[PDB]
Amino acid sequence: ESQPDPTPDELHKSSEFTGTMGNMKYLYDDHYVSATKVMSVDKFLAHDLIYNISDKKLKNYDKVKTELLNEDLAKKYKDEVVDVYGSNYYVNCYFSSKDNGGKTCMYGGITKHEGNHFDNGNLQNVLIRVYENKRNTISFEVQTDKKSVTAQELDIKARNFLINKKNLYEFNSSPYETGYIKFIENNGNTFWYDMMPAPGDKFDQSKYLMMYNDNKTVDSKSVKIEVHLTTKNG
Ligand SMILES: [Zn+2]
């Protein structure tokens, strides 16, 4: 059923990462694609959808391609009016079938608009508990207007806060050696994401963000979230 917690040896270690941690920071530091009530207009590969979404803030794009885990998911949302929220990238973002106004790429992040908001139009607060070397040091809330929200949206908001509050990611490296965010649903199901880059000297943004392609959603009103960091080295 649910995924078992991380084994000690499998968590990515920042000490084994030789690239620029700033490239991971970029993906979560006040960085995200957002849109409401849109419908896809085109496709590239069988598992993706293309939307006309403009970079409101910093005019960097007018088109967005989101890749999904499979062809079924893409077909399911193809003609639906949806809301979008996710972390985008530009390096190795591929479009056109020889040819096929900037463009940007991302994974998952879509939810149906209809019936997915709160009656009183208020926002739902989600508590995030932070653990450092097995100690709950701080806890804070992030918000969403969606009853059923993607795990990606909640993750992004949580890391954005920790970047500023705890300097989660810096340009050169990170004060933490290990890190993973865990979700606990009200039906008992659990799952987690590794918050550190794979070992080596070159961070692959596209490959990392791919973990969101399942378009996983959770009930904002009842889900629990825990961030587990260690400085177990230094
Ligand atoms: Zn909506």
Coordinates of C-alpha atoms and ligand atoms in Angstrom, one line a residue:
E1 CA 0.0 0.0 0.0
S2 CA 2.0 3.0 1.3
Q3 CA 5.7 3.5 0.7
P4 CA 8.0 2.6 3.5
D5 CA 10.2 5.3 5.0
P6 CA 13.8 6.0 3.8
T7 CA 16.5 3.5 4.6
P8 CA 19.6 5.2 6.0
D9 CA 21.9 4.4 3.0
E10 CA 19.5 5.5 0.2
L11 CA 18.9 9.2 1.1
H12 CA 20.9 11.6 -1.2
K13 CA 23.8 13.3 0.7
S14 CA 24.7 16.9 -0.1
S15 CA 28.3 16.0 0.7
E16 CA 28.4 13.7 -2.3
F17 CA 27.0 16.5 -4.6
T18 CA 29.7 18.5 -6.4
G19 CA 27.5 20.8 -8.5
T20 CA 25.8 24.1 -7.8
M21 CA 23.2 23.9 -5.0
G22 CA 21.9 27.2 -6.4
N23 CA 20.3 25.2 -9.2
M24 CA 18.1 23.4 -6.8
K25 CA 17.3 26.6 -4.9
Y26 CA 16.2 28.2 -8.2
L27 CA 13.4 25.6 -8.5
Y28 CA 11.7 26.6 -5.2
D29 CA 12.7 30.2 -4.4
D30 CA 9.6 32.2 -5.1
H31 CA 9.4 30.1 -8.3
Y32 CA 6.3 28.6 -9.9
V33 CA 3.8 28.4 -12.7
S34 CA 0.2 29.3 -11.8
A35 CA -3.0 29.5 -13.8
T36 CA -6.8 29.1 -13.4
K37 CA -9.5 27.6 -15.6
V38 CA -7.5 26.7 -18.7
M39 CA -7.8 23.9 -21.2
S40 CA -4.9 22.3 -23.2
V41 CA -4.5 23.5 -26.8
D42 CA -1.8 21.1 -28.1
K43 CA 0.4 18.1 -27.4
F44 CA 4.0 17.0 -28.2
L45 CA 4.4 13.4 -26.9
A46 CA 1.5 11.1 -26.0
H47 CA 1.8 11.8 -22.2
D48 CA 1.8 15.6 -22.3
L49 CA -0.4 18.6 -22.6
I50 CA 0.4 22.2 -23.7
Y51 CA -1.4 25.2 -22.3
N52 CA -1.5 28.9 -23.2
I53 CA -0.2 30.4 -19.9
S54 CA 1.6 33.7 -19.7
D55 CA 4.5 34.5 -17.3
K56 CA 2.5 37.2 -15.6
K57 CA 5.3 38.3 -13.3
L58 CA 8.6 38.2 -15.3
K59 CA 7.3 37.9 -18.9
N60 CA 9.4 34.7 -19.6
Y61 CA 6.8 32.5 -21.4
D62 CA 3.4 32.3 -23.0
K63 CA 3.2 28.5 -23.4
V64 CA 3.6 25.7 -20.9
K65 CA 4.1 22.0 -21.5
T66 CA 3.4 19.6 -18.6
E67 CA 4.5 15.9 -18.8
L68 CA 2.5 13.2 -17.1
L69 CA 3.3 9.7 -16.0
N70 CA 1.4 8.1 -18.8
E71 CA -1.0 8.4 -21.8
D72 CA -4.1 7.7 -19.6
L73 CA -3.5 10.7 -17.4
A74 CA -3.0 13.0 -20.4
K75 CA -6.3 11.8 -22.0
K76 CA -8.2 12.3 -18.7
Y77 CA -7.2 16.0 -18.5
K78 CA -6.9 16.8 -22.2
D79 CA -10.4 18.5 -22.5
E80 CA -11.0 19.4 -18.9
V81 CA -11.0 23.0 -17.5
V82 CA -8.3 22.9 -14.9
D83 CA -6.1 24.9 -12.4
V84 CA -2.3 24.7 -12.6
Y85 CA 0.5 24.9 -10.1
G86 CA 4.1 23.7 -10.3
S87 CA 7.9 24.2 -10.6
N88 CA 9.1 25.0 -14.1
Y89 CA 12.5 24.6 -15.9
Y90 CA 14.1 25.8 -19.2
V91 CA 17.2 23.7 -19.6
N92 CA 16.4 20.7 -21.8
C93 CA 12.8 21.7 -22.2
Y94 CA 11.8 20.3 -25.6
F95 CA 9.0 21.3 -27.9
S96 CA 8.2 20.9 -31.7
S97 CA 7.9 18.1 -34.2
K98 CA 10.4 19.8 -36.3
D99 CA 9.1 23.2 -35.6
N100 CA 5.7 22.6 -34.1
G101 CA 7.1 34.0 -27.2
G102 CA 9.0 31.9 -24.7
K103 CA 8.2 28.4 -23.6
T104 CA 8.7 26.5 -20.3
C105 CA 8.3 22.9 -19.1
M106 CA 7.1 21.2 -15.9
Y107 CA 5.5 17.9 -14.6
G108 CA 2.0 17.1 -13.2
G109 CA 0.5 20.0 -11.2
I110 CA -3.1 19.9 -12.6
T111 CA -6.5 19.7 -10.9
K112 CA -10.1 20.0 -12.2
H113 CA -11.5 23.5 -11.4
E114 CA -15.2 22.5 -10.8
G115 CA -16.2 21.5 -7.3
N116 CA -12.6 21.9 -6.0
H117 CA -13.0 25.0 -3.9
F118 CA -14.3 25.9 -0.4
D119 CA -18.0 27.0 0.0
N120 CA -17.0 30.0 2.0
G121 CA -14.2 30.8 -0.4
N122 CA -11.7 30.8 2.4
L123 CA -8.2 29.3 2.2
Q124 CA -7.1 26.0 3.9
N125 CA -4.1 26.1 6.1
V126 CA -1.8 23.0 6.2
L127 CA 0.6 22.5 9.1
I128 CA 4.2 21.5 8.3
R129 CA 6.3 20.0 11.1
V130 CA 10.1 20.3 10.8
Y131 CA 12.5 17.9 12.4
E132 CA 16.2 18.5 12.7
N133 CA 18.3 15.5 13.8
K134 CA 15.1 13.9 15.2
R135 CA 13.8 17.0 17.0
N136 CA 10.7 18.9 16.0
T137 CA 12.4 22.4 16.0
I138 CA 9.7 24.5 14.3
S139 CA 6.3 24.2 12.7
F140 CA 4.5 26.5 10.2
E141 CA 1.4 26.7 8.0
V142 CA 1.1 27.1 4.2
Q143 CA -2.2 27.8 2.4
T144 CA -4.2 26.7 -0.6
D145 CA -7.6 27.4 -2.1
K146 CA -8.0 23.8 -3.3
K147 CA -9.9 21.0 -1.4
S148 CA -7.9 18.5 -3.5
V149 CA -4.4 19.8 -4.0
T150 CA -1.3 18.3 -5.7
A151 CA 1.4 17.2 -3.4
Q152 CA 3.7 19.3 -5.6
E153 CA 1.9 22.6 -4.7
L154 CA 2.3 21.9 -1.0
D155 CA 5.9 20.8 -1.3
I156 CA 6.9 24.0 -3.2
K157 CA 5.3 26.3 -0.7
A158 CA 7.0 24.5 2.2
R159 CA 10.5 24.6 0.6
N160 CA 10.0 28.3 -0.3
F161 CA 9.5 29.1 3.4
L162 CA 12.4 26.9 4.5
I163 CA 14.8 28.6 2.0
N164 CA 14.2 31.9 3.7
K165 CA 13.7 30.7 7.3
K166 CA 16.3 28.0 7.5
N167 CA 18.4 28.6 4.4
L168 CA 17.5 25.2 3.1
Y169 CA 19.4 25.7 -0.1
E170 CA 22.3 28.3 -0.7
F171 CA 24.4 29.0 -3.8
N172 CA 27.3 26.7 -3.0
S173 CA 25.7 24.0 -0.9
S174 CA 23.3 23.4 2.0
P175 CA 23.7 23.4 5.8
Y176 CA 21.9 20.0 5.8
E177 CA 23.3 16.6 4.7
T178 CA 20.0 14.7 4.4
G179 CA 16.4 15.7 3.8
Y180 CA 13.0 14.3 2.8
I181 CA 9.4 15.5 3.0
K182 CA 6.7 13.0 4.0
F183 CA 3.0 13.0 3.4
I184 CA 0.5 11.2 5.7
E185 CA -3.1 11.0 4.3
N186 CA -6.2 10.5 6.5
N187 CA -6.7 7.0 5.1
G188 CA -3.3 6.0 6.5
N189 CA -1.3 6.1 3.2
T190 CA 2.2 7.6 3.4
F191 CA 4.8 8.7 0.7
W192 CA 7.9 10.8 0.5
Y193 CA 10.3 12.8 -1.7
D194 CA 14.1 13.1 -1.4
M195 CA 14.9 16.8 -1.0
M196 CA 18.6 16.6 -2.0
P197 CA 20.2 16.3 -5.5
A198 CA 21.6 13.0 -6.8
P199 CA 25.3 12.5 -6.3
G200 CA 27.7 13.9 -9.0
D201 CA 28.8 17.2 -10.3
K202 CA 25.9 18.1 -12.5
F203 CA 22.3 18.7 -11.2
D204 CA 19.7 17.7 -13.8
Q205 CA 16.6 19.8 -13.1
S206 CA 14.3 18.0 -15.5
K207 CA 15.2 14.6 -14.2
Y208 CA 14.7 15.7 -10.6
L209 CA 11.3 17.4 -11.2
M210 CA 10.1 14.2 -13.0
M211 CA 9.1 12.8 -9.6
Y212 CA 6.0 15.0 -9.8
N213 CA 4.7 13.4 -13.0
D214 CA 2.2 11.1 -11.2
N215 CA 0.1 14.2 -10.5
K216 CA -0.5 13.0 -6.9
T217 CA -3.2 14.9 -5.0
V218 CA -4.2 15.0 -1.3
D219 CA -7.1 16.3 0.8
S220 CA -5.8 19.7 2.0
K221 CA -8.1 19.7 5.0
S222 CA -6.8 16.4 6.5
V223 CA -3.3 15.7 5.2
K224 CA -0.3 15.8 7.6
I225 CA 3.3 16.8 6.5
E226 CA 6.7 16.3 8.1
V227 CA 10.1 17.5 6.9
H228 CA 13.0 15.4 8.2
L229 CA 16.5 17.1 7.9
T230 CA 19.8 16.0 9.4
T231 CA 23.2 17.7 9.7
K232 CA 24.3 14.2 10.9
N233 CA 27.7 15.0 9.3
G234 CA 28.1 18.6 10.1
Ligands
ZN1 ZN -10.2 26.7 -9.7

